[PDB]
Each structure stands twice: as structure tokens, then as C-alpha cells.
RNA sequence: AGUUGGGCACUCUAAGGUGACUGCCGGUGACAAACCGGAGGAAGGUGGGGAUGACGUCAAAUCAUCAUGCCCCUUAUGACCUGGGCUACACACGUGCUACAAUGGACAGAACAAAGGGCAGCGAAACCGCGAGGUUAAGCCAAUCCCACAAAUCUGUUCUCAGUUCGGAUCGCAGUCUGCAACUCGACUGCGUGAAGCUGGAAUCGCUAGUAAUCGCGGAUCAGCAUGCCGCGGUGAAUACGUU
């Protein structure tokens, strides 16, 4: 119950309010960050194999 | 004196009205500018022309005469139709609005 | 002019030696003024003291960041600095004292 | 592991003295020392002013009717719990003096602290302060147990 | 005049800003050195796992280098050789 | 809980990025149009051993740099592929895209390859046990100051799943200064899903 | 809605004119427990869907500065 | 009013370098390895802190991130919509915040920060409102403008531990914002009430230094919501006898 609800996210809603947010790789909600769009595992995955031009590994 | 048992024992005059079912801080202090006290007295430490403009400005005032019956008044008026808020009130149980798993143990 | 710089607990202090009398001007206010808790006034004293520079040098520091007593620090820290390029005869008194650590 | 050692301000504006300022150290209650060095300060002038006498002797009389020379530390015999007298070394002598000194102050109950640190000051340069009494006490703990020293 | 050059990485930063001012230098523009300008960076702590130990986490940065360049004679030959510069996309001029 | 990736803790240090531009107000819309580059091009050339890919926008153009290994098979006929690749990609970003190849020396070398053959093989059915040894060796006589290979899951054997190691040669991954290529791959087979970790350690840089 | 002014459904405010236009009837169902109460309200019998099924309740005069909602419980508590 | 004229000294900023490495001396020592002290030195014995977590155990957690073999439903265990619910509450338990008080209550004046965010976004300033907040609107794609008026602290008035000028829970009324919509189910503000609590028993937890403790600030998620999580700064100590 996935692509559904996915397409639901996509069609706009009678009012604008119901609009949120969607990782639009495995269309998760819970923490898929504006910048980025991924969700917390994709955003991890792609940053460890080079993708992400900007971002680093934080130590300070 | 004022609308009842007075404190006027060791109390200034802005924290003993507190002590009246009507009276807070604020209101203290806009009565007593209109008295013209200073509000740096103590209330048994006063003339009579001072009290009796405090107990007039008070009297013009709703203090403890119809505010615990216009309180009950309204409670009656909202639980008498159902008024699920009212229900609570009645039960026992916060009025306000508070989740029942946890605190807000105030109510039984 | 005798310049020495001083950093203390996310701050710094820009002092300046110039030959006075002794007075102390921290961003165009006095000790006291801007200091209270003579504790630390003292303790910014402390490099005056162990030489002998009671009212011989006029004090004008410019500070910022920091707290009271990071900005204490940074101060003496740059009055030791400024009073060491003055006369580097001395340099084992403060030494022994501190005032070349940087916490 | 091995020990190690300590320091702190020395100096001190008024009353200067090691020990006075390892008291405004002491009573620091979340850091505040301004409030502990302002109330340490106004305790020394009650204590100038309520008497004539400087505030530095009656201080050394009372830190050393209160020093507490031994200590008794716990002994687990078995199923006796075995309590056994120390000596005390003049470090933690001052310390426990110190302790104290603030404890019983902030327990004696008065309008202010620096009231209640003059009372307890006076009364222990007299050899009669709540400190003293805790001295007394923890002094005849070890005379009890002074079988195993 | 104001050029505005913002990098990830230094390393190429330093390259460009090296060809930017011998460009305008070597015609009169009078330019002053990259100035060295305070980075901006943001963090991204995410919880290193999928479901459970909230406790472990891991901790991403965002690294942004820029510098300015400011050029002070017109030298009009300066700005076309400005506008005849190429350089990777980690750059971003902005004038 | 246990090894990081070596490739997620070298890069901003010694290893470069896959992946250069400055995004303005545009870096959400970027980098979810390279990902979907990366994919298509990915499912597209799965047949032509491809290893990495680096993109780079060059305001309002994009530049494509493909690492093959056998790049005559990705160019074709020459025309025909590049036409196929980059008409497509310009279509589905809409905007001018250009390609570039290049091809990859000791292709044993390098991990992505390195585990898409080891995936092929176990999915053509091809003991781990000689295919394991086997890659460790060529690599090795390819040139490696280090190899290690990974092989976890359903093997065929049992309801109980292990994993297998097989490695030679210094593999430093706490080194900070290795430059160890890390790949991951998956062998869907009959009895489930099989997972394969290579890690090659080629040199490090004074 | 606070100083937009007291908000209602627009079916439900067609559906109390269409019924106040000329006489009562009979027990009105809605789903809306949001909208307010309007002094035009009383005497309107309505049937609140509290979730499980419509219950009927009477408007009257200490009624008109609240919601349905309000008298119309969702969970059961004995 | 650092605003202006003038400069790139200093701070500061961001690039490349030096520096610290038991480097040297004394002593112990197997002469070595190694240890205590001392001098020079900003840094003395992996300087302070973070990432870097081996082979393996716990068939530990996750088919609900994704994929995934097998089994099962398939005009239905698939799919669309309104409302309710996920916020329940007789009782208990972890985590966190507020108090039980005069180191403080309330009021008045003064001063020190860091870090970070901002385009349908941050939004100065002005006007209005006892107030949450509303209208016009400069500036800002940013070391410029905003968020953003820091608090503890100091200096003054006053209260004297009275269940109190401590506590505000809870409650009635009246308003403000958000968004189709705030009763079930948000936040904030003013009036009045102010309940328990007077420091907490079994027992137990965290911390060897800019640590704890304490006081504020920003950020992600976000129309709207923070006592939750991450980060920054301000004030800032006591002990370490010794492994029974």
C-alpha cells in the first residue's frame, strides 16, 4: 500500500492544507528532509557512495 | 469593612485586597490609584476618608458579592444542556480539555 | 604604545600600553563601570603588581565576545602580553605567575 | 590511577587569606560565586560590626574549634560493619570545617544567610556552634571505636 | 564589480581564484586578492539506524567556501576577459 | 552495528565526488533528476559492466564522464548509442545533456565491476566457494596491495544462512589513507537474496 | 474561525433554512460536528454523527454559543 | 548612531606554513624498554573533544525503508470517500519540566555571548490593542537586512518563611493566531480562584574540569503546534585516602 498512497500524495487534495511531504524515492513520510527530499536511510545511503555533492562526514 | 472579613493586620494594601474573593494584583493596583494611596501603606495604618473611598471604589466593583454565584450560574447554564465539557465538570473530571491516561489528576 | 593581544573563554581583548598614570579604560568605560566583583579587577591587576608599574602606564583596551570573567581574562592576558613587549627583563615573574598559558 | 592535587583562587579583595577564599568557593550554588563572595563579605562586616573584633581572628577560632582531628571511616568485619577511628590530615580537616561551617549555617534558619554564617561563626569562636557540636560528636564516634585505631 | 565565487571544496576554489586575478590583473583591473570570506555550515544529525537505538546516530556537514574578488579600474578588456572564462560547475559566479 | 562504509568515510578527504555543482535554490530538483539519470543509465547498460557515473552541471548543460571498462560495447555503432543515451536524457531532463566515456585499466580493479561479476556468477549458479578464490586471485594478479570478498545468505545448504570471507594482503579500512574502492551488490536466486561486499585496497598517497 | 465570524457548513445552513422557511420537521442527520450553533438554530431538532450512529439532540437557549460536537459524545465511558 | 573622510595596523575571517615529537636535563632502571620531577616552550608524556567499534555471541531488532524465496486473498487480506479513533483512565511504572522558598518573591536601572536559518521565506520600522496579536511595509538569495529587545549577573525598593507577595495545577469568563475547520483535539494572552507541596522512605542514577550544576539562544520536522532531539554560549566548583 505504497504506490497508492504515493499518487494520493501526488494528486492535489480538496484543500491545500492536506499537501505534506514524500521522499519521492520510497515514498516515505517520517523525517524526509526539504533540502534534500530523501528520507533518513536514502539520504544515508546516497551520501556514503559519493552522491550529495556537498555534504561530508561532521566531526568537530 | 471592605466586603467582609478584612486582613488589614500586617499586610500593605496592594497584597491585602489580594486576600478578597475578586481582587488579584492588577486590580488592587487600579483601585488604589484611583484611592490615591500610594500603594506603599498598611491598610490598618489609614484614615477614614482613605477607606472609605477604597471601600466605595470596591463596592462599585464586582468583589465577592455576585462572582461566586455568576460562576455557578454559568456552570449550571453549561451543564444543564449536556455540553460534553459540562459533563466533565459534573463528573469530576477536567473541564478544560486534558488527556485522562496521565496528569491532570486534579479532578478526583 | 605597547600593543598585546588577549583571548580568554571565547573572547578577546585588544590592549595597549601608553605612559600614564594608571588609568584603565575598557571600551570607553571605566573598571568599575563596566567590571564589578573587584575579585577580578585584582585579578586583572595581578601582572601590574608583580612589577613595579603601579601608575606608570595608561591602560586603553577594546573587548568583545565572551563573558565578565572571559572577558577578564583576555584582558590581563593582553595587559601581561603588551607589559612583556614593553620589557622582556621580567619575563620569568609573569611566567612563573601564569599569564602565558591561554587556558 | 595514582593521587592528584588541586588549586584555586588564592588571592582575595577583602580579608585576604587562602582559606577565606576556599569558603566563597564553598556555598557556590550553581555557580553563583558573586553571591556567595557578596554574602561571605556582609557576614565578615556583621561580624566586624556586632562585635569589636576583626573578623579574622574569630574566624581562625572557630575554624579551629571545628577542625575535627579524626574521622571514623566503615570497616565491613562480615556481618559486624565495623566502624574504624581515622587521622584526619589538615587538607581534609579544613574541608570537613568548611562543610560544616555552610551546613549548619544554611540549617540554622534566619531572615538571611549572612546572619546565620555570623551566628554560627560567633558561636563557634566560642566553642559553642553547631559546628563544634558535630566535632564533639564525631570525636567521641571515634573514642567508641578507638579499639582498633 | 564585486564577484562573488562560492565553493564546497578549497581545493578547487583556490584554482579559480588564482586564474580570476591574474585574468584581471594582467590588463590593469587593480583587483584585490581573493578575500577570504567566513564559510557557512549546516549539520544534519540522523539517526543511524532504521528502527530502534534512537541513542545512535550519525552526523552529515555541509561545507560552503567562498571568497570575494572586487575589481576597482573599468579596463573594459577585463570584463571581457571575464566573460570568456570557463571553469567547473563548483564555482557558481556571481557578480 | 559494526564496519562503516570505507567510501562514506574517505570521501571529503582523499577520494573525490560522484557528483559537482553548485545548486541554487535548485539542489531538491537536481539531485532527484541525477538520481533518476543514474538509475535509467544504470538499468540501460547493466549489460556493459559499468562501474561509476560523475555528473556535472554546467548552467543549463549537462556533462556526463561513464567509467565502461569495455566501452566498445556502450559506443555501438557510435552514433546510435550516444543518440540513444543522450536524446533520452535530454528528454527527460529537458535540457542540453552531453556524454563523455572513458575506459577503466585492470578492470579487476575495480569494485563495482569486481562485485557485479561475483553477482552474475552466483546467479548463473556458479559455486561461491571457486568463485570467491577465483576474483581474489585475478584481482591479486591485477594489481592489489589487498583484497577481501563477502558472500552472505541463502547458499543453498539449509534454513540456517551464513557468510563467507575470503581475503589476502594488508586491508587497512581504519587507515584514513587507503583509497578502498567498497561495492556492494545483490543475486536474487531461487532460495532468496544474496548480498556481496568487496572492499579492494589498491595504495595509499603520502 | 474567531473573528471571521461563527463558522458552518454550507449544506447544513440550505438544509436549517429549507426547514425554518416554513415549520419544523422531523429530526435533521448531519455529519457536521464543527459548526456552530446560530440563534436561528433553536427549536431544530438534529442527529449528530458521533461516529457509531446519529443522536438526536434539541437546540435551546444555553445551547447557542457552542458546537454540536459538544453534545454529542464520541467515546463511551459507562 | 562605525554611520561618514582615510587605512588594512589589530581583532576577525579563509588558504598555505611553523610548532609538540618523551624534544633536552636530573634521577630510577638491565645500560635498554619504560617511569617521577625539572627547565625551554602556548601546549609534556595517545594536550582537550568527535569519526574511525576485529574476529564472534545474543536464531537481538527490522518482511513496516527497499528488495526478498515460500505460503495465502484476488469482484478482495486489492482500491475510493465522510466521521470517529490513534489524545480513552479505575490504578501502577520509566524519561523529562514546575515547585515546596528568603542564595529567594515582586518591581525599577545597567552589562557581557556563541552558533545557526531566511524567497510565496525571514520579515525591521510605523500605527493600533492592558495582551496574546492585526494593517502598511524598508531590507534581505544574505560578514550588509531580519529572525533577535538574551537570561543568569550587578545595582536599588520590599517581603520574613503565614501553606506566605512561594506554587500555579485545576477551573469560569473575555480575546489573539494557525488552517476548509481548534467541542471530541493545538498554542498564546488578560481578569478572578488558587490544590497539593514545607525537600521526599525502600533504594537508586549521573559526574574526576571549563565536567557537573545552573540560565538562556538557534535549528531540523512544521499552516499550526516542543517540558522532546541536536548544537552554541554565560556563571561555574569539591572530592579522588584506597581498592577491602
Given at each position: 500500500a505504497?504506490?497508492?498512497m504515493?499518487?494520493?500524495?501526488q494528486?492535489?487534495?480538496?484543500?491545500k492544507?492536506?499537501?505534506?511531504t514524500?521522499c519521492?524515492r520510497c515514498?516515505?513520510?517520517?523525517?524526509?528532509?526539504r533540502?534534500?527530499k530523501?528520507c533518513?536511510?536514502?539520504?544515508?545511503?546516497?551520501?556514503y557512495?559519493?552522491q550529495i555533492?556537498?555534504?561530508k562526514?561532521?566531526?568537530? | 469593612?471592605?466586603a467582609?472579613?478584612?486582613?488589614?493586620?500586617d499586610?500593605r494594601?496592594?497584597?491585602?485586597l489580594?486576600?478578597?474573593?475578586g481582587?488579584?494584583?492588577?486590580?488592587?493596583?487600579?483601585?488604589?490609584?484611583?484611592?490615591?494611596?500610594?500603594?506603599?501603606?498598611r491598610v490598618?495604618?489609614?484614615t477614614?476618608?482613605?477607606l472609605?473611598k477604597?471601600?466605595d471604589?470596591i463596592d462599585?466593583?464586582?468583589?465577592?458579592?455576585?462572582?461566586?454565584?455568576?460562576?455557578?450560574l454559568?456552570i449550571?447554564?453549561?451543564?444543564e444542556?449536556?455540553?460534553?465539557?459540562?459533563i466533565?465538570?459534573?463528573?469530576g473530571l477536567?473541564?478544560?480539555?486534558?488527556n485522562?491516561?496521565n496528569n491532570?489528576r486534579?479532578?478526583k | 604604545?605597547?600593543?598585546?593581544?588577549?583571548?580568554?573563554?571565547?573572547?578577546?581583548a585588544?590592549?595597549?600600553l601608553?605612559?600614564?598614570?594608571?588609568?584603565?579604560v575598557?571600551?570607553?568605560?571605566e573598571?568599575?563601570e563596566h567590571?564589578?566583583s573587584?575579585?577580578?579587577?585584582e585579578d586583572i591587576?595581578?601582572?601590574?603588581?608583580?612589577?613595579?608599574?603601579?601608575?606608570?602606564?595608561?591602560?586603553?583596551?577594546?573587548?568583545?565576545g565572551?563573558?565578565?570573567?572571559?572577558q577578564?581574562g583576555?584582558?590581563?592576558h593582553?595587559i601581561?602580553?603588551?607589559l612583556?613587549?614593553?620589557?622582556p627583563?621580567?619575563r620569568?615573574?609573569?611566567?612563573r605567575?601564569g599569564l602565558?598559558?591561554?587556558? | 590511577?595514582?593521587?592528584?592535587?588541586?588549586?584555586?583562587?588564592?588571592?582575595?579583595?577583602?580579608?585576604?587569606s587562602?582559606l577565606?577564599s576556599?569558603l566563597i568557593?564553598?556555598?557556590?550554588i550553581?555557580?553563583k560565586?558573586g553571591?556567595?563572595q557578596?554574602i561571605?563579605?556582609?557576614s565578615?562586616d556583621?561580624i566586624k560590626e556586632?562585635?569589636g573584633?576583626?573578623?579574622?581572628?574569630?574566624?581562625?577560632?572557630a575554624?579551629?574549634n571545628?577542625?575535627?582531628?579524626?574521622?571514623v571511616?566503615?570497616r565491613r568485619?562480615?556481618g559486624?560493619?565495623?566502624?574504624?577511628?581515622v587521622e584526619?590530615?589538615?587538607?581534609?580537616?579544613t574541608?570537613?570545617?568548611?562543610?560544616?561551617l555552610?551546613?549548619?549555617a544554611?540549617?540554622?534558619?534566619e531572615?538571611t544567610?549572612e546572619e546565620?554564617?555570623?551566628?554560627?561563626?560567633?558561636d563557634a569562636?566560642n566553642n559553642?556552634?553547631?559546628?563544634?557540636?558535630?566535632?564533639?560528636?564525631?570525636?567521641?564516634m571515634?573514642?567508641?571505636?578507638?579499639?582498633?585505631? | 564589480?564585486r564577484?562573488?565565487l562560492?565553493?564546497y571544496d578549497?581545493?578547487?576554489?583556490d584554482?579559480?581564484?588564482?586564474?580570476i586575478?591574474?585574468?584581471?590583473?594582467?590588463?590593469?583591473?587593480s583587483?584585490?586578492?581573493?578575500?577570504?570570506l567566513?564559510?557557512?555550515?549546516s549539520?544534519?544529525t540522523?539517526?543511524?539506524?532504521?528502527?530502534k537505538?534512537?541513542?545512535?546516530?550519525?552526523?552529515?556537514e555541509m561545507?560552503?567556501?567562498?571568497?570575494?574578488?572586487?575589481i576597482?579600474?573599468?579596463?573594459?578588456?577585463?570584463v571581457?576577459?571575464?566573460m570568456?572564462?570557463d571553469?567547473?560547475?563548483?564555482?557558481?559566479?556571481?557578480? | 552495528?559494526?564496519?562503516?562504509?570505507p567510501?562514506?568515510?574517505?570521501?571529503?578527504?582523499?577520494?573525490?565526488?560522484?557528483?559537482?555543482?553548485?545548486?541554487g535554490?535548485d539542489?531538491?530538483?537536481?539531485?532527484?533528476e541525477?538520481l533518476?539519470?543514474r538509475e535509467?543509465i544504470?538499468?540501460?547498460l547493466?549489460?556493459?559492466?559499468?562501474s561509476?557515473?560523475?555528473?556535472?552541471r554546467?548552467?543549463?548543460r549537462?556533462?556526463?564522464?561513464?567509467h565502461?571498462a569495455?566501452?566498445?560495447?556502450?559506443?555501438?555503432?557510435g552514433?546510435?548509442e550516444?543518440e540513444?543515451?543522450?536524446?533520452?536524457?535530454?528528454?527527460?531532463?529537458?535540457?542540453?545533456?552531453?556524454i563523455?566515456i572513458?575506459?577503466?585499466?585492470?578492470?579487476?580493479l575495480?569494485a563495482?565491476?569486481?562485485?557485479?561479476?561475483?553477482a552474475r556468477?552466483?546467479?548463473?549458479?556458479?559455486?561461491?566457494?571457486?568463485?570467491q578464490?577465483?576474483q581474489?586471485?585475478?584481482?591479486?594478479?591485477?594489481?592489489?596491495?589487498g583484497?577481501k570478498?563477502?558472500?552472505?545468505?541463502?547458499?543453498?545448504?539449509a534454513?540456517?544462512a551464513?557468510?563467507?570471507?575470503?581475503?589476502?594482503?594488508?586491508?587497512?579500512?581504519?587507515?584514513?589513507?587507503?583509497?578502498?574502492?567498497?561495492?556492494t551488490?545483490?543475486?536474487?536466486?531461487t532460495?532468496?537474496?544474496?548480498?556481496?561486499?568487496?572492499?579492494?585496497?589498491?595504495g595509499?598517497?603520502? | 474561525?474567531?473573528?471571521?465570524?461563527?463558522?458552518?457548513?454550507?449544506h447544513?445552513?440550505?438544509?436549517?433554512?429549507?426547514?425554518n422557511?416554513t415549520?419544523?420537521?422531523?429530526?435533521?442527520?448531519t455529519?457536521?460536528?464543527?459548526?456552530?450553533?446560530?440563534?436561528?438554530?433553536?427549536?431544530?431538532?438534529?442527529?449528530?454523527?458521533?461516529?457509531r450512529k446519529?443522536v438526536?439532540?434539541?437546540?435551546?437557549?444555553?445551547?447557542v454559543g457552542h458546537?454540536?460536537?459538544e453534545f454529542?459524545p464520541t467515546?463511551?465511558?459507562?
Open positions: 505504497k504506490k497508492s504515493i499518487a494520493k500524495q494528486r492535489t487534495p480538496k484543500f492544507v492536506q499537501e505534506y514524500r519521492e515514498g516515505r513520510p517520517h523525517s524526509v528532509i533540502k534534500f530523501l533518513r536511510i536514502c539520504f544515508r545511503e546516497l551520501a557512495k559519493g555533492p556537498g555534504v562526514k561532521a566531526s568537530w | 469593612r471592605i467582609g472579613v478584612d486582613i488589614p493586620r499586610k494594601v496592594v497584597i491585602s489580594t486576600y478578597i474573593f481582587i488579584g494584583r492588577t486590580t488592587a493596583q487600579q483601585v488604589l490609584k484611583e484611592a490615591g494611596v500610594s500603594e506603599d501603606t490598618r495604618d489609614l477614614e476618608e482613605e472609605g477604597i471601600r471604589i462599585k466593583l464586582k468583589v465577592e458579592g455576585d462572582l461566586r454565584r455568576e460562576v455557578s454559568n449550571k447554564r453549561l451543564i444542556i449536556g455540553s460534553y465539557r459540562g466533565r465538570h459534573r463528573r477536567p473541564v478544560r480539555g486534558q485522562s491516561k491532570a486534579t479532578r | 604604545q605597547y600593543y598585546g593581544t588577549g583571548r580568554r573563554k571565547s573572547s578577546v585588544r590592549v595597549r601608553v605612559p600614564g598614570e594608571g588609568r584603565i575598557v571600551n570607553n568605560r573598571i568599575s567590571i564589578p573587584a575579585a577580578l579587577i591587576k595581578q601582572p601590574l603588581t608583580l612589577t613595579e608599574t603601579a601608575g606608570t602606564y595608561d591602560v586603553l583596551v577594546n573587548v568583545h565572551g563573558g565578565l570573567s572571559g577578564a583576555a584582558i590581563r593582553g601581561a602580553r603588551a612583556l613587549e614593553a620589557d627583563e621580567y620569568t615573574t609573569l611566567k605567575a602565558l598559558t591561554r587556558d | 590511577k595514582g593521587p592528584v592535587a588541586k588549586r584555586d583562587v588564592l588571592p582575595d579583595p577583602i580579608y585576604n587562602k577565606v576556599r568557593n564553598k556555598m557556590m550553581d555557580g560565586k553571591k556567595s557578596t561571605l563579605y556582609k565578615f556583621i556586632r562585635t573584633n576583626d573578623a579574622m581572628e574569630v574566624f581562625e577560632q575554624l579551629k571545628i577542625m575535627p582531628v579524626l574521622e571511616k566503615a568485619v562480615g559486624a560493619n565495623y566502624q574504624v577511628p584526619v590530615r589538615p587538607e581534609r580537616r574541608t570537613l570545617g568548611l562543610r560544616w555552610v551546613n549548619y544554611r540549617l540554622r534558619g531572615k544567610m546565620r554564617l555570623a551566628n554560627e561563626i560567633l569562636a559553642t556552634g553547631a559546628a563544634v557540636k558535630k566535632r564533639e560528636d564525631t570525636h567521641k571515634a573514642e567508641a571505636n578507638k579499639a582498633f585505631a | 564589480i564577484i562573488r562560492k565553493a578549497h581545493r578547487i576554489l584554482q579559480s581564484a588564482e586564474k586575478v591574474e585574468t584581471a590583473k594582467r590588463s590593469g583591473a583587483v584585490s586578492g581573493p578575500i577570504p567566513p564559510t557557512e555550515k549539520v544534519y540522523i539517526l543511524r539506524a532504521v528502527h537505538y534512537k541513542d545512535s546516530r550519525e552526523q552529515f561545507r560552503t567556501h567562498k571568497r570575494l574578488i572586487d576597482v579600474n573599468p579596463t573594459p578588456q577585463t571581457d576577459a571575464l570568456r572564462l571553469l567547473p560547475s563548483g564555482v557558481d559566479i556571481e557578480i | 552495528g559494526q564496519k562503516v562504509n567510501v562514506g568515510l574517505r570521501i571529503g578527504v582523499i577520494r573525490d565526488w560522484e557528483s559537482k555543482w553548485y545548486a535554490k539542489y531538491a530538483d537536481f539531485l532527484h541525477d533518476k539519470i535509467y544504470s538499468k540501460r547493466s549489460d556493459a559492466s559499468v561509476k557515473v560523475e555528473i556535472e554546467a548552467a543549463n549537462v556533462n556526463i564522464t561513464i565502461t569495455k566501452p566498445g560495447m556502450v559506443i555501438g555503432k552514433g546510435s550516444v540513444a543515451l543522450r536524446k533520452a536524457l535530454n528528454s527527460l531532463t529537458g535540457k542540453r545533456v552531453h563523455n572513458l575506459e577503466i585499466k585492470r578492470a579487476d575495480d563495482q565491476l569486481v562485485a557485479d561479476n561475483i556468477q552466483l546467479e548463473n549458479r556458479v559455486s561461491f566457494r571457486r568463485a578464490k577465483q581474489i586471485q585475478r584481482t591479486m594478479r591485477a594489481g592489489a596491495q583484497v570478498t563477502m558472500v552472505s545468505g541463502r547458499l543453498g545448504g534454513d540456517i551464513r557468510s563467507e570471507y575470503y581475503s589476502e594482503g594488508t586491508v587497512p579500512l581504519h587507515t584514513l589513507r587507503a583509497d578502498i574502492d567498497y561495492a551488490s545483490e543475486a536474487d536466486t532460495y532468496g537474496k544474496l548480498g556481496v561486499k568487496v572492499w579492494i585496497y589498491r595509499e598517497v603520502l | 474561525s474567531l473573528k471571521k465570524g461563527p463558522f458552518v457548513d454550507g447544513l445552513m440550505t438544509k436549517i433554512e429549507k426547514l422557511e415549520d419544523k420537521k422531523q429530526v435533521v442527520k455529519w457536521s460536528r464543527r459548526s456552530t450553533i446560530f440563534p436561528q438554530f433553536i427549536g431544530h431538532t438534529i442527529a449528530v454523527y458521533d461516529g446519529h438526536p439532540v434539541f437546540i435551546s437557549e444555553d445551547m458546537k454540536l460536537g454529542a467515546r463511551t465511558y459507562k
